[PDB]
């Protein structure tokens with residue numbers, strides 16, 4: 001890689017942003033060198049479901065000191081279900097274990113699972129407190145699902161910046177924010193994500209393994225965060241936020257894939 005290639009990538013990101021109505025917020029970090037490719041890196045974006053990575057990390061951190069927490073069963077009823085709860089709607093009554101809730105919220109973006117885990121931790125402010133503990137001064141979780149997805153212009157609730165989220169994803173999945181076993185579990189869950197095949201995954205080479213978490217809001221908006229694990233070189237962190245409002249899902253996913261492709265080109 002080189003600075004010149006990273007500057008070219010940033011120009012290509014600006015050109016990409018001109019292809020849709022809205023803003024692109026992008027950071028990629030090459031962990032072999034620390035090199036960064038950035039576009040609107042310090043602007044706030046609604047994080048939508050990508051916060052579920054921070055949420056699950058906070059649960060895992062608590063589980064490091066409570067060996068039974070991940071097996072604890074949390075009951076809930078049909079009245080507790082919010083919109084888009086494909087896994088939790090199957091287990092109304094006796095409910096699900098904390099580990100199962102984490103897997104559901106990470107791999108299917110299950111919203112009720114997220115709310116149950118937020119309540120487990122003591123409320124949304126506990127997720128913000130966890131972010132502070134790992135060095136993220138920017139992240140703020142103010143609301144629960146599904147209200148946190150409103151994305152009102154100028155509203156800083158339930159936002160972060162691409163730079164702050166990339167730093168947190170790096171520390172969580174590649175670095176020292178969590179203990180060994182918990183870092184590994186977070187990677188395992190995110191490697192098994194079911195919702196992101198058309199986003200960051202679609203922009204990187206086939207042999208790369210991707211651990212990602214998607215987000216989706218109103219009006220065909222979307223985002224994706226994660227780490228790619230190339231087969232014989234160092235991991236690369238990807239954070240792609242947008243305020244894109246699209247006519248269809250394919251257009252939105254193509255922008256996110258393209259942004260990842262631009263950074264992969266610069267770093268290989």
Ligand SMILES: *[B]([O])([O])[C][N]C(=O)/C(=N\OC([C])([C])C([O])=O)C1=[C]SC([N])=N1
Pocket residue numbers: 048049050083084109111146149150214215216217218219
């Ligand atoms: B998260 O951002 O993944 C939670 N997403 C949602 O609640 C919404 N949609 O869910 C679908 C489209 C199934 C998804 O792919 O995540 C959503 C749609 S509009 C809105 N405000 N939230």
